[PDB]
Write a protein that binds this ligand. Structure first.
Ligand SMILES: Cc1cc2nc3c(=O)[nH]c(=O)nc-3n(C[C@H](O)[C@H](O)[C@H](O)COP(=O)(O)OP(=O)(O)OC[C@H]3O[C@@H](n4cnc5c(N)ncnc54)[C@H](O)[C@@H]3O)c2cc1C
Ligand SMILES: Cc1cc2nc3c(=O)[nH]c(=O)nc-3n(C[C@H](O)[C@H](O)[C@H](O)COP(=O)(O)OP(=O)(O)OC[C@H]3O[C@@H](n4cnc5c(N)ncnc54)[C@H](O)[C@@H]3O)c2cc1C
Lengths: 495, 498
């Protein structure tokens, strides 16, 4: 038949490698293109895309290093381990690089063994069935029944702010810096911004976040603000309603001029203001692939305006930019194309965890989205704010430069549990929220239970595992409406 | 006046304090008795019972100290933190003691604020409505509509093994030793024994477990054996099918003579062989409260053979000896008696976690109980063995004394995920099992999902949180039956980046 391939995948990240391997499982001929355009600062990397190289994986290793710093500062001596420690940025980088190298190789092999032809070049569309790449500086064209776009995004730097592109780094550079970043400015109170600032502060760097308005826009306000309260109490500085308007090299430092007329010097400036979909090189306009006002491909069912051309992951408008969503969309697409499946993701139940110094895991609706959808009177919020048992016994203290009196000694309680329930459906759980340690580990299971239609009664009749934080979800009784105190001061942990 | 009290509770542990505070909530007059008989080695403590003083709370703080030791030995340098460290046993004890003291005080207050009359004396039954206690060396009797027994257990030491009672410690003593235990023998591959041996080894002590037969009897074999495999690779020694027959003091050490004719010196010997219900002081025989052959009270629905007398917690036959089971039974009993409730616990869905150096959380049936109940052919086991991402990148190594060659450097993979499903019910999940870090944190949620009737399909269509270990439960595909390798060697953690 008139096609060299059954499936050509442009992009070897979470979406692309998943689609490609699953297609190849059904005896289909599959080619995958992945090439890394260097960052605004010349950083590049191997196969596996944003999550493997410059996202979830390295961020989680840096978070782990941060939790180790925190445990050593706050906890080690109290639990009988008298420790002296010094942090060496280049050692942590070296451990990240070595683990990511192992994963680059692991994914190359996974593709070859999985009968996918991997090509390390930039691909572009020629027509609805044809893709072009260079190979020894010689354009080649290959034909496919089906084409999948999964090119992901890259960090966005404001072109209007002078010096930004030249002098600032992004998430593409932060995990691999040859030198420690020293005094750091992070612009963006997005999850990437807060996570990045959170681990740089925990690791002992002088850290400042420029937050234009509010933290974690779209996320539950109560939880988003508890995180910022905790980050402030552990030494992150926040400029609220302020952004850079100018960025200059003054000798070895970066002089940043702020929108409130203030000035401050930093060693490192990192933009975490968002990401644009990397689609400009794809030749979408000429082929008839429709894009939204944001530049994202219109494909609410993975199918673009061109019926031989599909898209998944961060480049698709109206879906969360998360790795598991990219992967499962790639696998389900592969099955629908080649195994007679008609299964899509249920986008109502996409859980997420933010890996801030205390983590935040949720699925379903914030208090705000719940109140907006069902009305204030059909909503109950059950919640509890408490300390992990082990942390309670550690007596974690504020740095002495942030003390306000003789009874402000303690860090905030590390945990917050909240269920958002609809009264007119026997208190059905429509929102689950947990701030605290291991929040992703806690939320995964609860997210399944919430998807299966768990009620507040189901949560009350649930037997707890003791001692855990997650057992708190079985004895929540204080409501926001009641106006009574949701703090628990006694240290039984999750209760 | 018919009865002085609505409810009298004998025992101020998890069951008793929960029943008592909940009864008092409904305007009922409530008395609670708690007194601590000293351990075989003279150790005593305040209000709150086994979990607060000599169980879950101190065990979990010692485990945390162990995780800290492990993180500093294995991980700190790799994650950029060059450290020097030394362990001080008495400092950890002091941090435990301070936190437990705060909890003793917190519970005294919680009872007074909650309108419960707390009495620090031993109580016994006089008849179906009467209990006796001493007070300034003067016997007093008080009358109640209802009496609740929640006296818990105490560690059991074999009377048959000479020197055992005199020279050995139990879980009652281990958290408060004034001196570090040094070289330690633990008898029992029960959860208490393994957890105890696990943290003493992690904390740098020369540790040995005398295991009569198998680890964690009643628990899933595959998971129980992964734990012992991991504990062995990190320095715990296991004597299999061997137990002490004699225990003697040679100077300041304890010479232990074993059933296989072998002999060895230890600084500390700890019996974790199990626990007997503390009911001998209660005068049960004379009142007509029926007990099993094990001495546990027969009360399958909390009601004893005497209908005014109830029981909850560790003393009741045929229920798990866990704190949340004690608490919820206490609360539900209080509600049935005084708030017109008719709710009992569903004993089919009681999750538990063992806090071994890698933890083990589960709910429902082992592979063994699943195969026995439904038959081998109506059972699928889906599983994956892998490493946490962070642990994978740390390259955790065996201690040099257990190395056999140049390729046995690595610790076992830290994680094992397993679902046990029934084919004839569209692969309904009847058993959930997770070995690895934060296993209780992972299991709590899944336990609820499994109770609500989650299928293998539900698990496969579940969106992952990345990077976690718990996302592995969304992509399990290898079956035991398939005989294929369930190991993954690459370090994407629980999930796949693609
Ligand atoms: C700092 C950070 C932290 C994150 N943390 C998490 C987290 O904790 N959990 C989570 O679930 N998600 C997380 N994410 C999100 C996650 O990284 C993405 O959602 C996911 O990687 C999306 O994958 P994708 O398949 O859309 O494409 P990507 O993984 O981004 O890969 C697309 C690939 O295409 C390549 N490419 C682009 N154009 C072409 C071309 N024309 N030809 C060939 N190759 C091309 C790119 O170089 C890239 O390799 C994080 C993201 C970032 C930036
Ligand atoms: C080492 C260890 C670790 C454990 N770890 C865990 C764990 O991690 N998770 C978990 O869920 N469970 C754990 N447990 C189990 C948990 O401690 C018990 O299941 C629970 O505490 C039992 O509660 P209870 O109400 O039956 O009795 P207890 O909590 O034992 O309290 C009974 C109280 O009554 C007192 N008493 C006895 N006789 C009388 C009398 N005549 N008059 C007055 N007072 C009396 C006792 O001294 C005690 O104070 C552990 C147990 C041990 C020993």
């Amino acid at each position: 038949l008139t096609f060299m391939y059954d499936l050509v995948v442009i992009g070897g990240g979470s979406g692309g490698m998943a689609a490609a391997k699953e297609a190849a499982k059904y005896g289909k001929k599959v080619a995958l293109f992945d090439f890394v355009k260097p960052s605004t600062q010349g950083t590049k990397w191997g196969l596996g895309g944003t999550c493997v190289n410059v996202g979830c994986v390295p961020k989680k290793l840096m978070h782990y290093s941060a939790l180790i710093a925190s445990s050593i500062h706050h906890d080690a001596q109290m639990f009988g381990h008298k420790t002296s420690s010094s942090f060496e940025w280049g050692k942590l980088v070296e451990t990240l690089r070595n683990h990511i190298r192992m994963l680059n190789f692991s994914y190359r092999t996974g593709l070859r063994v999985g009968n996918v032809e991997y090509i390390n070049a930039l691909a572009k569309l020629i027509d609805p069935h044809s893709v072009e790449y260079e190979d020894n500086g010689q354009k080649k064209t290959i034909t496919s029944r089906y084409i999948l776009l999964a090119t992901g995004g890259r960090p966005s730097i404001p072109e209007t702010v002078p010096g930004a592109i030249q002098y600032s780094i992004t998430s593409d550079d932060i995990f691999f810096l040859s030198k420690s970043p020293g005094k750091t400015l992070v612009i963006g109170a997005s999850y990437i911004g807060l996570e990045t600032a959170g681990f740089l502060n925990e690791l002992g760097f002088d850290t400042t976040v420029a937050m234009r308005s509010i933290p974690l826009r779209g996320f539950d306000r109560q939880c988003s603000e508890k995180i910022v309260e905790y980050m402030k109490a552990t030494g992150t500085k926040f400029l609220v309603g302020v952004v850079p308007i100018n960025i200059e090299k003054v000798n070895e430092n970066i002089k940043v001029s702020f929108s409130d007329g203030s000035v401050e010097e930093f060693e490192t400036v990192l933009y975490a203001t968002g990401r644009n979909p990397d689609v400009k090189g794809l030749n979408l306009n000429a082929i008839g692939v429709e894009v939204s006002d944001s530049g994202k491909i219109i494909a609410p069912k993975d199918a673009t305006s061109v019926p031989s051309i599909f898209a998944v992951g961060d480049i698709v408008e109206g879906r969360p930019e998360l790795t598991p969503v990219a992967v499962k969309a790639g696998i389900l697409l592969a099955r629908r194309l080649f195994a007679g499946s008609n299964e899509f993701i249920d986008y109502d139940f996409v859980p997420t965890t933010v890996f801030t110094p205390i983590e935040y895991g949720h699925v379903g609706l914030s208090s705000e989205a719940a109140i907006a959808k069902y009305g204030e009177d059909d909503i109950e919020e059950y919640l509890s704010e408490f300390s992990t048992l082990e942390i309670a016994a550690a007596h974690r203290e504020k740095p002495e430069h942030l003390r306000e009196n003789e009874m402000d000694f303690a860090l905030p309680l590390n945990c917050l549990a909240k269920l958002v329930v609809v009264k007119s459906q026997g208190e059905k759980v429509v929102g689950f929220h947990f701030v605290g340690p291991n929040a992703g580990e806690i939320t995964q299971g609860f997210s399944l239970a919430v998807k299966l239609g768990a009620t507040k009664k189901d949560f009350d009749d649930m037997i707890g595992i003791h001692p855990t934080d997650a057992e708190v979800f079985g004895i929540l009784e204080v409501t926001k409406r009641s106006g009574e105190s949701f703090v628990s001061s006694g240290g039984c942990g999750g209760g």
